[PDB]
Amino acid sequence: GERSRESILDATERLMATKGYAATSISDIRDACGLAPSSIYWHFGSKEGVLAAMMERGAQRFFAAIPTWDEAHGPVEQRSERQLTELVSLQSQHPDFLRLFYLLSMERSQDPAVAAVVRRVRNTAIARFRDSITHLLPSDIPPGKADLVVAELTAFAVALSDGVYFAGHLEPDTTDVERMYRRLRQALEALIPVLLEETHHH
Amino acid sequence: GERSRESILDATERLMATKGYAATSISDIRDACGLAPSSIYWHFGSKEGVLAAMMERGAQRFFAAIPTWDEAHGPVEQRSERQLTELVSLQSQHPDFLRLFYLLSMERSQDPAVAAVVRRVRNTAIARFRDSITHLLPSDIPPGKADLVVAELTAFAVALSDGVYFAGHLEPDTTDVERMYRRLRQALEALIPVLLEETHHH
Ligand code: NA
Numbered sequence: 001g002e003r004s005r006e007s008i009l010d011a012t013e014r015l016m017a018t019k020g021y022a023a024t025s026i027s028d029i030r031d032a033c034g035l036a037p038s039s040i041y042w043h044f045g046s047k048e049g050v051l052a053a054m055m056e057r058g059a060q061r062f063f064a065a066i067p068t069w070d071e072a073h074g075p076v077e078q079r080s081e082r083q084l085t086e087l088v089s090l091q092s093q094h095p096d097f098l099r100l101f102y103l104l105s106m107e108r109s110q111d112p113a114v115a116a117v118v119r120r121v122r123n124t125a126i127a128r129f130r131d132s133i134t135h136l137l138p139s140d141i142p143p144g145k146a147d148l149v150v151a152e153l154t155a156f157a158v159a160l161s162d163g164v165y166f167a168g169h170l171e172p173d174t175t176d177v178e179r180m181y182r183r184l185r186q187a188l189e190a191l192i193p194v195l196l197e198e199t200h201h202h
Numbered sequence: 203g204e205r206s207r208e209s210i211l212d213a214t215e216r217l218m219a220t221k222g223y224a225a226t227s228i229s230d231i232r233d234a235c236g237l238a239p240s241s242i243y244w245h246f247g248s249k250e251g252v253l254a255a256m257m258e259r260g261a262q263r264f265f266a267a268i269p270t271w272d273e274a275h276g277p278v279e280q281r282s283e284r285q286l287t288e289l290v291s292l293q294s295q296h297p298d299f300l301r302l303f304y305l306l307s308m309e310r311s312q313d314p315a316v317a318a319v320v321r322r323v324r325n326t327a328i329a330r331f332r333d334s335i336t337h338l339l340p341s342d343i344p345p346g347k348a349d350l351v352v353a354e355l356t357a358f359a360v361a362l363s364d365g366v367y368f369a370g371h372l373e374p375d376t377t378d379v380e381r382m383y384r385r386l387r388q389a390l391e392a393l394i395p396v397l398l399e400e401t402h403h404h
């Protein structure tokens with residue numbers, strides 16, 4: 001099934017870019033990838049399902065290009081910096097999967113299969129941020145306390161990172177993605193002791 | 203013109219909530235507000251124009267409920283805190299105008315009149331954040347340098363604030379809006395000396 005699916009998604013991607021969503025028909029997609037409407041529906045159920053799958057595939061490619069903490073090479077002190085430089089580079093490309101993700105997340109989606117796609121991509125991003133953020137804390141924090149601090153830091157980072165995409169979309173000419181992320185790293189470093197102490201009100 | 207417009211927007215708001223955008227017809231809107239399709243088109247041009255105007259009106263109500271720095275009362279040291287508490291309160295309601303703003307900003311919009319609406323709302327938010335952020339700096343910063351630092355802080359705040367809405371939409375049950383904004387205020391306080399020093403590389 002995989003290869004047919006890839007071909008459908010490639011064609012729909014190019015078509016939507018060209019014509020927009022509304023003007024792109026299943027028949028246009030067939031014309032471009034050589035698979036009959038019957039075969040397209042069999043794989044994606046609907047046009048909206050195709051868009052959702054195109055968004056997920058973009059997301060998977062994005063995440064695969066960012067090393068997990070264990071995959072990052074070089075000194076363990078600089079693994080955090082390697083991850084971040086890959087994020088910066090991918091984000092500064094302004095990838096279309098993100099536009100699609102934010103759009104689908106805000107739409108009150110007609111096709112009920114879209115929500116699961118949105119949820120999966122979102123949870124992956126949160127888990128990936130969590131992964132790297134755990135390594136910013138001192139290693140002597142009791143694990144439960146660390147889980148709390150990391151969760152909060154992770155939400156802050158995910159929020160800032162979401163906003164960076166909007167800045168790139170709406171202020172493309174004045175937005176330095178590398179610099180925004182540097183500010184995030186700096187904010188996280190500062191917030192760590194704050195969260196450690198405020199949490200001690202437990 | 204004002205009062206007819208308000209009535210059209212009220213009706214479309216209720217209708218979209220109920221049926222969704224696609225299922226809401228101009229005729230449904232007429233049925234609900236008592237203004238003929240001819241009069242609806244005269245004011246908004248198209249259905250998309252109605253949605254854009256509904257989004258802007260929501261935004262205007264939102265901004266009007268947040269005091270400018272000069273409007274805030276109480277000690278000038280606590281004006282920043284008053285502004286922020288109103289922001290927290292409005293954001294924690296998860297207002298629909300924001301969903302619409304993010305959606306319209308991500309859509310490749312068919313009606314060319316929508317972009318100007320998006321631009322206006324966005325510029326207002328940036329100016330409002332800028333306004334309050336200027337008061338976080340020491341008063342002895344040379345004005346030009348302050349403009350730079352404030353701009354950067356403003357972009358960071360706008361980005362974090364955008365992300366807070368996504369957290370409220372996608373992690374509603376685990377997102378504390380007051381706490382996220384407290385973290386933003388704390389991050390800004392920490393970033394100020396960082397930006398002052400890094401800027402001294404000019
Ligand atoms: Na994509």
Ligand code: NA
Pocket residue numbers: 256257258259260261298299300302
């Ligand atoms: Na609205």
